Amino acid sequence: RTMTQSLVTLAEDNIAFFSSQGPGETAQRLSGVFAGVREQALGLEPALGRLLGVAHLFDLDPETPANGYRSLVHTARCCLAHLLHKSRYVASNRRSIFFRTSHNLAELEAYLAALTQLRALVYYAQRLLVTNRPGVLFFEGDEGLTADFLREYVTLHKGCFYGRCLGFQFTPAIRPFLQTISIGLVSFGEHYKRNRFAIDPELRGAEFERITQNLDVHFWKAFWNITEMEVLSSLANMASATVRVSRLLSLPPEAFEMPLTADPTLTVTISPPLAHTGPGPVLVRLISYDLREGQDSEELSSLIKSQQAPRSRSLIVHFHGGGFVAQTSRSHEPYLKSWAQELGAPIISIDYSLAPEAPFPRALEECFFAYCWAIKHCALLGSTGERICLAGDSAGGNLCFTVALRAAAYGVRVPDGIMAAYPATMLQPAASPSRLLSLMDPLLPLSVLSKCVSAYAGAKTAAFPEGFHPRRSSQGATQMPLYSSPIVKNPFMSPLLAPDSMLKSLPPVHIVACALDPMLDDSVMLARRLRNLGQPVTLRVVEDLPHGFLTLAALCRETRQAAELCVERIRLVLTP
Amino acid sequence: RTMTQSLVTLAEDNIAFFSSQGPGETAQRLSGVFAGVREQALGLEPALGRLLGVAHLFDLDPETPANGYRSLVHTARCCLAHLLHKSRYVASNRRSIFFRTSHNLAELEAYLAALTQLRALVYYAQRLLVTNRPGVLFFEGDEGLTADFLREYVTLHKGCFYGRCLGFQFTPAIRPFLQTISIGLVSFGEHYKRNRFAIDPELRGAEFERITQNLDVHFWKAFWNITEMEVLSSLANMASATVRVSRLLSLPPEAFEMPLTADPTLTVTISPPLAHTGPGPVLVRLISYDLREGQDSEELSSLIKSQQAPRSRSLIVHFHGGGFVAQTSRSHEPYLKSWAQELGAPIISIDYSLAPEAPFPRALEECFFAYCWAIKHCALLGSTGERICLAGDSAGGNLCFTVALRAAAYGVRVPDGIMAAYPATMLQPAASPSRLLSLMDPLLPLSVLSKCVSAYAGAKTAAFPEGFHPRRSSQGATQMPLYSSPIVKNPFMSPLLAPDSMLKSLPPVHIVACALDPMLDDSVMLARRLRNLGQPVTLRVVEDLPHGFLTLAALCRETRQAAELCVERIRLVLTP
């Protein structure tokens, strides 16, 4: 309340400060800009108040302020505080007209656009809040009305977050990296459309919002694995710790023997990953700190595709992230090598196959085969197998859940821990308050996750009160195929809306996320759907960071303490 | 002897191990490879012994073993130690033929080529030493026969230091960056010729050694200021420290007046810097940690081109480097900001004009004008002028001798100390034992600095015993115009061959250098020409690093303390 009035009480004087000392256009521009600033603050105060009150009404626990409503309120108050600081500075420094009016004119115009767009988004979040039943942050409606809701929200235009104001909601110590990532991605988009703009940030939005609705997942397939090509994969490894064992493996494409815990004398044989195209080489790769006992012999030396540490205690499995479409296992070492420094475990970072050329169930069976091969060939991997741990990543968190839960349907000993960081656990398309901030994020537009589930599932190719009208996206109405066949509503693909009776045997789960991800409301529903069953799950939320910070640890101080947050919670699995 | 004999005692068995266990071509290949290795070591040992004896005979002081002879001896010794370690590993691990013979065949033939080419270079060093008078590091001959020596050097072929073994003489932690850098040059060269190479290192030399002799100075005008563009400068600026004063200036192109310290009552006026094309704006930019007293007023704020810190004690001048053709003042920030953390002085990183469109004296008097303007407008720069400390780089290391001593010709007071990191003080073209290893350096070959003096000067466009026939460069004779008109004989281009009576009034000098630079023999020659006059000059040498590492401070674990060494000797000036 004191933040909103402070912009209003400095309005008329600053309107009178510039309108009385010049008849030019800039006096009218600045007076109208500051009148719009006070009007937007005063009109945005009560909707923010209702949002924060029901956000208190909405969260699962008081310890973790993790909802979409808190994130939208945080974005709005960050914009308001930035406008307040800029206003205080210009008010304290308006003795001369030494500063050019054009620069601050364009800055405050962009911030006017930011405040009016956040006003539209906060009104839409309030509409969703009224429409749904409180207590559930998702929607129970059918496909048609959910698609109508998603199209109605995505009709808005994003000319402010993608221009000069890219990254106001984050730490100021990270913004130049976001700007050069934007420049590089626009550069690849222009180069590949053809098969400068970095000086002027005003024209950055004029392509950064067109790539939101004019992008293909085959084209983002290059983006996650741009850290794979032989110059940057080599140039990203000086921050990586010391190592010796960085060898690939090649598993045989034939089934073997494995027992079940319900009766040790009875075993169950399960076929290799066929997916009606023929089993192939399950390509895994072992990353270990040193050569372990019984590991550097011929049984491991015979499977590489073209002193000794003692008997190990517990191997750590790993599935990479990268949207199930890119970022193979050759990219996650610079924190995987830093993982092995203190854990002391042979980290087999499985490179599972990637969508859409290898969708489910191929993408979920060879990591089911590699996990199955690693309880019996334990000495071949330099491990014992009396205790198993797990790891998860950006997209490989649902795959971290699914392969650790369908094993319980087979009777084989499941692991006793899950460490999935910001997982994509809600691949079923539905509107959500935290998925509303998917059109504004720096690294990914709303179309990253819209076309991620098209690749995985193998798909075949009043609204507003009168007088309120911000800029609207008139660049063609995007009508994409987002149909939900019965192969998408399942734990095996999205383990929330799974039947309740088969989530009881889940391992203990440790999960982290950030407050400003689209993968925030998805992870929040996980805690609510398991705290009513007695199973313990711990969700930790961080702030001022995007999603995709695990491959970005050696960049800033706040990304250091967030990507290291995965490490100390992954070793709680290791104790008996 | 024991390092060379130990390569011989495991030769006959190594031949008997492979030639008696297979009739294929690889047996003859490996036997010939190890015979060539043993004969190259045994024939290169006596030349190395003569070179080390005369290297002990030739250096100035025992404290700093810095010549060309020590550097060539170290290169040969490092190649021999690498081959010895590889032979030890292969001899200990030749129980099976599991390792592919082709890979070690290619590595060992590359090392055979390396030993042959280093043998040719060591023979060239011996012939040079012999020919010239002992005691003088440089040659006293005329232009014609020195050009004959240079061409008789150039006709050699360097197909070994630029292939897979690119960067053996340095630390292994630095080599991946050199590999990506080499990929950068080969991609730049093929793109610039036209207006993949990371998989096969054998084909890397076949383009790199053509790039060496087929590049232009305008081509190299982009490499050093590739960190000047806004995306890479922004991507490098987070490692720098915090700042608030990073403002450019714009000096008036009109003459003004100085006193003389010989007699304060008499006065002298500057002739404005014309270079027969008209005086312009002396672009100088100020870097300071905080706003200082009398600095943020209207006088400084009226010069930007389109609490308060107290009365400062002294300023620090800075001239950038970059071969006089690139690397302007907009590329030296990320370590210049760390300079202001402890020094407590305002850095004026002067952006002087750049060769070849602005040769001497245009590149000489603008920085003379900027230094002259800072003696009088001291408070306007937030200084007092009670002490001048001066800094230098690869190319700016002669600026702290040329314009820092020509002020004493004008009678005005001179700075009380010079810091010059690896200065280029012998721009007159002639060969030396440290200019010998200018064809093997990764980041710049010999045709970089030999063609950067045509830019600065504004130029107008038995040999071997019988049976010794290594690979020779038959790709055209590079008969470039390297004529030396008397404009390079003068003191104000290369101060070693200056008249003796004027270097007496030089300020005290502190110079750092590396043991593997082409600009090594010149920097040790500088201490020779001043230690016989009584003026104290200190020279520090480092190892395992190239020259050009000041912009590469925060990239390796060994360049961190080497670029910190420049700061350590730059604060010794500040004491009275």
mmCIF file with all atom_site columns, C-alpha atoms in Angstrom, chain B residues 489-553:
data_model
loop_
_atom_site.group_PDB
_atom_site.id
_atom_site.type_symbol
_atom_site.label_atom_id
_atom_site.label_alt_id
_atom_site.label_comp_id
_atom_site.label_asym_id
_atom_site.label_entity_id
_atom_site.label_seq_id
_atom_site.pdbx_PDB_ins_code
_atom_site.Cartn_x
_atom_site.Cartn_y
_atom_site.Cartn_z
_atom_site.occupancy
_atom_site.B_iso_or_equiv
_atom_site.pdbx_formal_charge
_atom_site.auth_seq_id
_atom_site.auth_comp_id
_atom_site.auth_asym_id
_atom_site.auth_atom_id
_atom_site.pdbx_PDB_model_num
ATOM 1  C CA . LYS B 1 489 ? 66.180 3.364   -37.085 1.00 0.00 ? 489 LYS B CA 1
ATOM 2  C CA . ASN B 1 490 ? 64.922 6.245   -34.971 1.00 0.00 ? 490 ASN B CA 1
ATOM 3  C CA . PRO B 1 491 ? 64.660 6.185   -31.167 1.00 0.00 ? 491 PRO B CA 1
ATOM 4  C CA . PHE B 1 492 ? 60.893 6.767   -31.161 1.00 0.00 ? 492 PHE B CA 1
ATOM 5  C CA . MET B 1 493 ? 60.116 3.433   -32.860 1.00 0.00 ? 493 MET B CA 1
ATOM 6  C CA . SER B 1 494 ? 62.637 0.977   -31.300 1.00 0.00 ? 494 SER B CA 1
ATOM 7  C CA . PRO B 1 495 ? 64.632 2.415   -28.383 1.00 0.00 ? 495 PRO B CA 1
ATOM 8  C CA . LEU B 1 496 ? 67.434 -0.197  -28.240 1.00 0.00 ? 496 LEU B CA 1
ATOM 9  C CA . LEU B 1 497 ? 69.360 1.214   -31.219 1.00 0.00 ? 497 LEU B CA 1
ATOM 10 C CA . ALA B 1 498 ? 68.722 4.751   -29.996 1.00 0.00 ? 498 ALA B CA 1
ATOM 11 C CA . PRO B 1 499 ? 71.653 7.061   -29.195 1.00 0.00 ? 499 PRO B CA 1
ATOM 12 C CA . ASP B 1 500 ? 73.063 6.259   -25.761 1.00 0.00 ? 500 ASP B CA 1
ATOM 13 C CA . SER B 1 501 ? 73.043 9.808   -24.318 1.00 0.00 ? 501 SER B CA 1
ATOM 14 C CA . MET B 1 502 ? 69.241 10.056  -24.275 1.00 0.00 ? 502 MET B CA 1
ATOM 15 C CA . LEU B 1 503 ? 68.355 6.790   -22.520 1.00 0.00 ? 503 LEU B CA 1
ATOM 16 C CA . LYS B 1 504 ? 70.241 7.979   -19.424 1.00 0.00 ? 504 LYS B CA 1
ATOM 17 C CA . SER B 1 505 ? 67.266 10.009  -18.145 1.00 0.00 ? 505 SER B CA 1
ATOM 18 C CA . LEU B 1 506 ? 64.838 7.081   -18.447 1.00 0.00 ? 506 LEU B CA 1
ATOM 19 C CA . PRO B 1 507 ? 62.424 6.386   -15.578 1.00 0.00 ? 507 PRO B CA 1
ATOM 20 C CA . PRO B 1 508 ? 62.910 3.138   -13.633 1.00 0.00 ? 508 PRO B CA 1
ATOM 21 C CA . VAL B 1 509 ? 61.390 0.209   -15.515 1.00 0.00 ? 509 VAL B CA 1
ATOM 22 C CA . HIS B 1 510 ? 59.750 -3.011  -14.356 1.00 0.00 ? 510 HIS B CA 1
ATOM 23 C CA . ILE B 1 511 ? 59.099 -5.566  -17.105 1.00 0.00 ? 511 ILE B CA 1
ATOM 24 C CA . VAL B 1 512 ? 57.502 -9.019  -17.024 1.00 0.00 ? 512 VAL B CA 1
ATOM 25 C CA . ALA B 1 513 ? 57.792 -11.519 -19.879 1.00 0.00 ? 513 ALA B CA 1
ATOM 26 C CA . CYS B 1 514 ? 57.343 -15.203 -20.674 1.00 0.00 ? 514 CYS B CA 1
ATOM 27 C CA . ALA B 1 515 ? 59.978 -17.744 -21.668 1.00 0.00 ? 515 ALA B CA 1
ATOM 28 C CA . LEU B 1 516 ? 58.095 -18.820 -24.834 1.00 0.00 ? 516 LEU B CA 1
ATOM 29 C CA . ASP B 1 517 ? 57.555 -15.552 -26.688 1.00 0.00 ? 517 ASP B CA 1
ATOM 30 C CA . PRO B 1 518 ? 58.976 -14.161 -29.923 1.00 0.00 ? 518 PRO B CA 1
ATOM 31 C CA . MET B 1 519 ? 59.258 -10.924 -27.922 1.00 0.00 ? 519 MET B CA 1
ATOM 32 C CA . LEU B 1 520 ? 61.662 -12.552 -25.488 1.00 0.00 ? 520 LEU B CA 1
ATOM 33 C CA . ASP B 1 521 ? 65.106 -11.820 -26.976 1.00 0.00 ? 521 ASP B CA 1
ATOM 34 C CA . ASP B 1 522 ? 64.203 -8.145  -27.328 1.00 0.00 ? 522 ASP B CA 1
ATOM 35 C CA . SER B 1 523 ? 63.070 -7.759  -23.716 1.00 0.00 ? 523 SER B CA 1
ATOM 36 C CA . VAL B 1 524 ? 66.264 -9.345  -22.356 1.00 0.00 ? 524 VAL B CA 1
ATOM 37 C CA . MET B 1 525 ? 68.244 -7.156  -24.782 1.00 0.00 ? 525 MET B CA 1
ATOM 38 C CA . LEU B 1 526 ? 66.568 -4.156  -23.121 1.00 0.00 ? 526 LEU B CA 1
ATOM 39 C CA . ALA B 1 527 ? 68.066 -5.085  -19.751 1.00 0.00 ? 527 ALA B CA 1
ATOM 40 C CA . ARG B 1 528 ? 71.461 -5.531  -21.446 1.00 0.00 ? 528 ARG B CA 1
ATOM 41 C CA . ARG B 1 529 ? 71.441 -2.024  -22.931 1.00 0.00 ? 529 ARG B CA 1
ATOM 42 C CA . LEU B 1 530 ? 70.538 -0.404  -19.585 1.00 0.00 ? 530 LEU B CA 1
ATOM 43 C CA . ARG B 1 531 ? 72.553 -2.442  -17.062 1.00 0.00 ? 531 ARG B CA 1
ATOM 44 C CA . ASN B 1 532 ? 75.790 -1.122  -18.598 1.00 0.00 ? 532 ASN B CA 1
ATOM 45 C CA . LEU B 1 533 ? 74.606 2.466   -17.997 1.00 0.00 ? 533 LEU B CA 1
ATOM 46 C CA . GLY B 1 534 ? 73.744 2.273   -14.284 1.00 0.00 ? 534 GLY B CA 1
ATOM 47 C CA . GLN B 1 535 ? 69.988 2.686   -14.694 1.00 0.00 ? 535 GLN B CA 1
ATOM 48 C CA . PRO B 1 536 ? 68.168 -0.089  -12.774 1.00 0.00 ? 536 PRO B CA 1
ATOM 49 C CA . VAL B 1 537 ? 65.711 -2.190  -14.784 1.00 0.00 ? 537 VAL B CA 1
ATOM 50 C CA . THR B 1 538 ? 64.144 -5.397  -13.460 1.00 0.00 ? 538 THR B CA 1
ATOM 51 C CA . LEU B 1 539 ? 63.041 -8.201  -15.782 1.00 0.00 ? 539 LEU B CA 1
ATOM 52 C CA . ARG B 1 540 ? 60.818 -11.063 -14.635 1.00 0.00 ? 540 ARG B CA 1
ATOM 53 C CA . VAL B 1 541 ? 60.231 -14.175 -16.736 1.00 0.00 ? 541 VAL B CA 1
ATOM 54 C CA . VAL B 1 542 ? 57.485 -16.790 -16.520 1.00 0.00 ? 542 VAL B CA 1
ATOM 55 C CA . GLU B 1 543 ? 57.063 -20.132 -18.263 1.00 0.00 ? 543 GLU B CA 1
ATOM 56 C CA . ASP B 1 544 ? 54.540 -22.497 -19.894 1.00 0.00 ? 544 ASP B CA 1
ATOM 57 C CA . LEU B 1 545 ? 52.400 -19.598 -21.181 1.00 0.00 ? 545 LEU B CA 1
ATOM 58 C CA . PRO B 1 546 ? 52.213 -17.678 -24.466 1.00 0.00 ? 546 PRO B CA 1
ATOM 59 C CA . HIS B 1 547 ? 52.333 -13.908 -24.771 1.00 0.00 ? 547 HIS B CA 1
ATOM 60 C CA . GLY B 1 548 ? 48.966 -12.228 -24.907 1.00 0.00 ? 548 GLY B CA 1
ATOM 61 C CA . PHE B 1 549 ? 47.730 -13.584 -21.564 1.00 0.00 ? 549 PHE B CA 1
ATOM 62 C CA . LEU B 1 550 ? 46.662 -10.318 -19.903 1.00 0.00 ? 550 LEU B CA 1
ATOM 63 C CA . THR B 1 551 ? 43.199 -10.561 -21.490 1.00 0.00 ? 551 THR B CA 1
ATOM 64 C CA . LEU B 1 552 ? 43.114 -14.263 -20.543 1.00 0.00 ? 552 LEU B CA 1
ATOM 65 C CA . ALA B 1 553 ? 43.672 -13.824 -16.807 1.00 0.00 ? 553 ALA B CA 1
#
